[PDB]
């Protein structure tokens, strides 16, 4: 029971995982068992969702968040988001469950039975947190693995059946991307766009060619950076800029993950390309514009406005959602805005069906899963999957920002040596001159 | 020794739960208030007083159960079980809202007993009775809201009903009818409560982050001994930190802890004074100059005028169901709507 | 030394009356800009067409407001979530009319308050302190982000952000209750528990420490003079306070550890306010509070109202009046 | 001479706190005084 | 605006009378030694 009590380790039970900081084998076991937990949730949740999936009904009307992820990859779906077969969903769930059993076995072995420290057993797997070269080597290996994953998404898009394109003409279809955007100007212009209204930063990616080209760039960049970090040591500015300890690296990862969680919240709220409205449901702007367009064709068989910069837009409060772009609306949008005569005599039945269906499913609901306004009776059970994903990931991103602050401060204090409190005989403020 | 002295020694004997002389008032009254609330929220309806279901037996949940106030036609009757309204019948007593007055009166005397318990324990332990002084503010809030406010109004009906959603209704009622947010006494109450929460968080974090290293463990909690004479945290370092961050800092620990006493207690007392004013409908509903300006200028629009419109909407849309004794029949055309404004 | 080392030593100096630091070299200009723009807008800003329907709302003192009713009106609904600096408007009149000062103030304030949190960490590092006061400050900062940034992002317009004024804040509260039923949201209930408990525990801790002060004075002088700044001995008897509080409820409900007690004092309102800020953000993505309408039906099918139905009636009354 | 007379003290911190209390109360209640 | 005019003197007295009081006490504290 070495380092498994407060007296030897210095950490209480509620900080008991902090006893794993200098125990590489048990730390690896904790990580592998946790990865097994993640893959287990993926497999089990996919099997649960499939067990409760009605393929005829839309996915967003049944509270699914994992089946839409597989469907966006072009697996088991056809034109218009229709589910041609459900077997690949089952395959994904089962393979994840089995792989999670394997990872759980490895995690339990390394945490319980295997060597407590990996340093004496293997020079390659043994690591010290202060060894900057070994940290950069492990970071390089993981960067190569991440680049391979991005290229796996690319390979799925170009060769293994393609991806679901909601922007495909006729109402969206599974399409093989043959011409990805390799031009660095477009790809990094997405990085250089403003995050505000009408611009939307990388969330405003609106075609799969840009998505696949950006993933080609990301995979190549990650592989190159992985090779670079295997081959090199940190420079002097890097060594003087950072704290080099396990808690410090954890805090850096926590800050990165918090930022990524906020970005994913905005992606699932605004983007309808990598989160198609066929599976995930309409966005809030999408539902409002669908309401305006449907009531317009109702009243013509609504109102129009002029916008701050002079474009023909839907009138009303939905003037705030004039930057919305959707596959069912772009055929109607002309050079100066929504071409009204082109609404009158170019409207297609699939566009009207999409607009009415997206009218009825605005992303508004309650915690007890009651749809509609908060002042309305409980006759409709619909909270949008976009709402669930955005809310949950904002909560997680904020708490991970808090964790980043906690661990970054603690890492700095522990590196400087006052994380346990102020030394009574060497209190720094006493040596400092008084402010006045 | 005399029966009084022997009883006094028995009442103040050290045990797991202190009894004391104040226990004779506190324990029965607090037990009866809590038991009456649980009994009412579990079994007792509000169908005959409010036209509402408010018990688990009727199908409500924890958020929506309440022991509701008596009907408005009861007036300010004590509604005793043996009184002229219930005439000894427990069932009619429950149906008429007698459990509300039961809980309110026993809770009032229980709060009196708890404050006397604070005084008694401070006397025997040998400390100054500032905890009782601080507890005067919840008592002021309870007396102003649950007793003085309905006594100033028409009946017990307009007091808060003992429940979660019923209290939320009470909040919305005060917004719609009293404009209670505009009241400066409520503003001082909000400042007291939020400043007390801020002081709690800031003092706890400051103490926890200026601790002296008194142990070798990375968990600092075991580095404290209750019988130690030294300070466990550096007041000098904390003062320096807050002086350079905020401009000012506490330098006297005794003044700091008195200030922590002072802020929420004063806030709650100010809010109780405002609630007394609302008991007589003496509200800060409006600013007369802005009323005259809005009457003479149809284009003048501030957030205060929009709040007045929202209050009018609250009143007209909630009054027929929240005040069913008045038999308010508001036709659709008299209900205020934004699209007719 | 060169100018850069002298500047770095001045910036990170603990001998400055107010600490600057690098977070402070961002914090001071942004907060000064936000403060100056707020004072000028609160006194003298022209009316703002917040709904974009040519019906401007006057918020400044010079246009017929007092301290209570004055506000900096949020930017126009026609602006939406668009970035609206001064140079994006054709004229200063157009920038003022569309609520540009609100955007300037809130962006500068959010940046300055984030750097205020960073500066709190920075000074704690320079003084050899433990670093987690900034973690406690992250709860009101999260609340400010929720009401000024996250709720506009979810609703799609900075016109739905909280106005910078007292009556505007009340308007924000009432419209929020109308649209989201925040009172029935458990995160707001956790926030209310956080602030009520924070006030309770603040008064409790203050009264217990004041109750057990050690006699160092006379009746003719204030007891605060019994404490010397920087004295080594404790100024109050924590054992006597623990004995009192243990006899008040029972012995196991009382903290004998002052460090555990002060951690609890920090943790309760901070966690509660974290949850209420997250509640505001999650209702920004329209995940609203519990509905419970028509939850009790009799045998014949007639709806039996509850208190939640009265709440929904009030919410509908607010809803019909805040629209158009 | 009366032997019960004692000196009265108000430190600068108490002056600042009292001035803050008075000025903030005046800022709060001035709108209601003007009405 | 058509305010109560007495509010002015009210506000002024509300500022002046207590604050002056404190100032008096403070100044006579500083002259004691």
């Amino acid at each position: 029971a070495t380092n498994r009590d407060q007296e030897s380790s210095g950490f209480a039970w509620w900080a008991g995982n902090a006893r794993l900081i200098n125990l590489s084998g048990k730390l690896l076991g904790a990580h592998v068992a946790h990865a097994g937990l993640i893959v287990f949730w993926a497999g089990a949740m996919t099997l649960f969702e499939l067990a409760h999936f009605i393929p005829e009904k839309p996915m967003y009307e049944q509270g699914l968040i994992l089946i839409p992820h597989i469907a966006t990859l072009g697996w088991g779906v056809g034109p218009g988001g229709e589910v041609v077969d459900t077997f690949p969903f089952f395959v994904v769930g089962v393979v994840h469950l089995i792989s999670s059993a394997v990872l759980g076995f490895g995690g339990v072995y390394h945490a319980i039975r295997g060597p407590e420290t990996l340093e004496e057993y293997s020079s390659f797997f043994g690591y010290d947190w202060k060894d900057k070269n070994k940290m950069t080597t492990i970071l390089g290996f993981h960067l190569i693995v991440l680049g391979i994953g991005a290229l796996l998404l690319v390979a799925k898009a170009m060769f293994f059946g393609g991806l679901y394109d909601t922007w495909a003409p006729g109402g969206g279809d599974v399409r093989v991307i043959t011409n990805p955007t390799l031009d660095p100007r477009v790809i990094f212009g997405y990085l250089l766009k403003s995050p505000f209204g009408g611009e939307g930063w990388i969330v405003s990616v609106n075609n799969l060619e840009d998505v696949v080209g950006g993933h080609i760039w990301i995979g190549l960049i990650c592989i190159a950076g992985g090779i670079w970090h295997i081959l090199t040591t940190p420079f002097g500015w890097a060594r003087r800029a950072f704290i080099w300890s396990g808690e410090a690296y954890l805090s850096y990862s926590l800050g990165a993950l918090s930022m990524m969680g906020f970005i994913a919240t905005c992606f699932v709220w605004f983007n309808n390309t990598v989160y198609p409205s066929e599976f995930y449901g309409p966005t809030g702007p999408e539902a409002s514009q669908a309401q305006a367009m449907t009531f317009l064709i109702r009243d013509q068989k609504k109102y129009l406005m002029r916008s701050p910069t002079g474009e023909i837009i839907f009138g009303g409060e939905t003037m705030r959602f004039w930057d919305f772009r959707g596959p069912w609306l772009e055929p109607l949008r002309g050079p100066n805005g929504l071409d009204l005569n082109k609404i009158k005599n170019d409207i297609q039945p699939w566009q009207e069906r999409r607009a009415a269906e997206y009218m009825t499913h605005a992303p508004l609901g309650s915690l007890n899963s009651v749809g509609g306004v908060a002042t309305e009776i409980n006759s409709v059970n619909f909270v949008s999957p976009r709402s669930w994903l955005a809310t949950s990931h904002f909560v997680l991103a904020f708490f991970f920002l808090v964790g980043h602050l906690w661990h970054a401060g603690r890492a700095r204090a522990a590196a400087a040596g006052f994380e346990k409190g102020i030394d009574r005989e060497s209190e720094p403020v006493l040596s400092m001159p008084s402010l006045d | 020794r005399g029966w009084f002295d022997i009883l006094d020694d028995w009442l103040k004997r050290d045990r797991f739960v202190f009894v004391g002389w104040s226990g004779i008032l506190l324990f029965p009254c607090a037990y009866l208030a809590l038991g009456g609330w649980l009994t009412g929220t579990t079994f007792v309806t509000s169908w005959y007083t409010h036209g509402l279901a408010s018990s688990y037996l009727e199908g409500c949940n924890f958020l929506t159960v309440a022991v509701s106030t008596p009907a408005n036609s009861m007036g300010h009757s004590l509604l005793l079980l043996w009184g002229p309204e219930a005439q000894g019948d427990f069932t009619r007593w429950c149906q008429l809202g007698g459990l509300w007055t039961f809980i309110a009166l026993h809770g009032a005397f229980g709060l009196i007993g708890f404050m006397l318990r604070q005084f008694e324990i401070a006397r025997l332990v040998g400390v100054r009775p500032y905890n009782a002084i601080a507890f005067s503010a919840p008592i002021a809030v309870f007396v102003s809201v649950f007793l003085i406010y309905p006594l100033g109004q028409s009946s017990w009906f307009f007091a808060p009903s003992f429940g979660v959603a019923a209290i939320f209704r009470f909040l919305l009622f005060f917004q719609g009818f009293h404009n209670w947010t505009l009241n400066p006494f409520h503003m001082m109450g909000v400042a007291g409560v939020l400043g007390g929460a801020l002081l709690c968080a800031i003092h706890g974090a400051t103490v926890e982050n200026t601790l002296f290293q008194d142990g070798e463990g990375a968990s600092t909690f075991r580095a404290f001994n209750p019988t130690q004479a030294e300070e466990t945290y550096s007041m000098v370092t904390a003062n320096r930190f807050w002086s350079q961050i905020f401009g000012i800092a506490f330098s006297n620990k005794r003044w700091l802890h008195f200030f922590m006493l002072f802020v929420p207690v004063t806030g709650l007392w100010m809010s109780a004074i405002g609630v007394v004013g609302l008991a007589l409908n003496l509200r800060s509903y409006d600013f007369i100059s802005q009323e005259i300006r809005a009457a003479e200028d149809p284009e003048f629009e501030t957030f205060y005028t929009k709040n007045l419109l929202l209050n009018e909407g609250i009143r007209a849309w909630m009054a027929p169901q929240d005040q069913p004794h008045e038999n308010f029949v508001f036709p659709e055309e008299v209900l205020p709507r934004g699209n007719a404004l | 030394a060169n100018l850069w080392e002298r500047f770095c030593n001045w910036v990170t100096s603990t001998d400055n009356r107010l600490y600057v630091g690098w977070f402070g070299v961002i914090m001071i200009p942004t907060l000064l800009a936000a403060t100056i723009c707020f004072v000028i807008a609160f006194i003298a800003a022209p009316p703002v067409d917040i709904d974009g329907i040519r019906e401007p709302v006057s918020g400044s003192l010079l246009y017929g407001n007092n301290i209570i009713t004055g506000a900096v009106v949020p930017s126009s609904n026609a602006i939406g979530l668009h970035f609206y600096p001064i140079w994006e408007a054709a004229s200063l009149d157009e920038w003022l009319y569309n609520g540009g000062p609100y955007q300037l103030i809130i962006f500068h304030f959010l940046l300055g308050a984030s750097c205020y949190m960073g500066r709190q960490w920075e000074l704690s590092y320079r003084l050899g302190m433990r670093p987690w006061i900034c973690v406690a400050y992250s709860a009101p900062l999260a609340s400010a982000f929720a009401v000024f940034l996250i709720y506009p992002i979810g609703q799609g317009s900075f016109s739905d952000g909280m106005p910078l004024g007292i009556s505007g804040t009340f308007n924000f509260m009432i419209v929020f209750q109308a649209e989201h039923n925040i009172l029935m949201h458990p995160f707001h209930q956790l926030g209310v528990a956080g602030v009520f408990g924070g006030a309770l525990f603040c008064a409790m801790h203050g009264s217990l420490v004041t109750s057990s002060l050690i006699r160092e004075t006379t009746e003719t002088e204030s007891a605060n003079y019994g404490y010397k700044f920087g004295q080594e001995e404790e100024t109050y008897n924590i054992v006597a306070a623990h004995g009192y509080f243990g006899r008040l409820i029972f012995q196991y409900a009382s903290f004998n550890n002052s460090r555990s007690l002060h951690f609890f004092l920090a943790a309760w309102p901070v966690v509660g306010v974290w949850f209420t800020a997250l509640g505001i953000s999650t209702m920004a993505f329209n995940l609203n509070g519990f509905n419970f309408n028509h939850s009790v039906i009799d045998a014949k099918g007639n709806v039996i109202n509850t208190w939640a139905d009265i709440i929904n009636r009030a919410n509908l009354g607010m809803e019909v009046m805040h629209e158009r | 001479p009366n032997p019960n007379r004692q000196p009265v003290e108000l430190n600068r911190t108490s002056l600042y706190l009292g001035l803050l209390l008075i000025l903030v109360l005046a800022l709060l209640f001035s709108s209601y005084f003007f009405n | 605006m058509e305010v109560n005019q007495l509010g002015l003197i009210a506000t002024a007295l509300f500022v002046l009378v207590p604050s002056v009081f404190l100032i008096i006490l403070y100044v006579q504290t500083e002259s004691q030694q």
Partner: peptide, 30 residues
Amino acid sequence: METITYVFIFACIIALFFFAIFFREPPRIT
């Protein structure tokens, strides 16, 4: 005179902030 009163009280508060920060009685150890 209403606006003048509000701005005057606010300016007095800001001046009091200045004097309370930079002209405070200094805390002295022991």
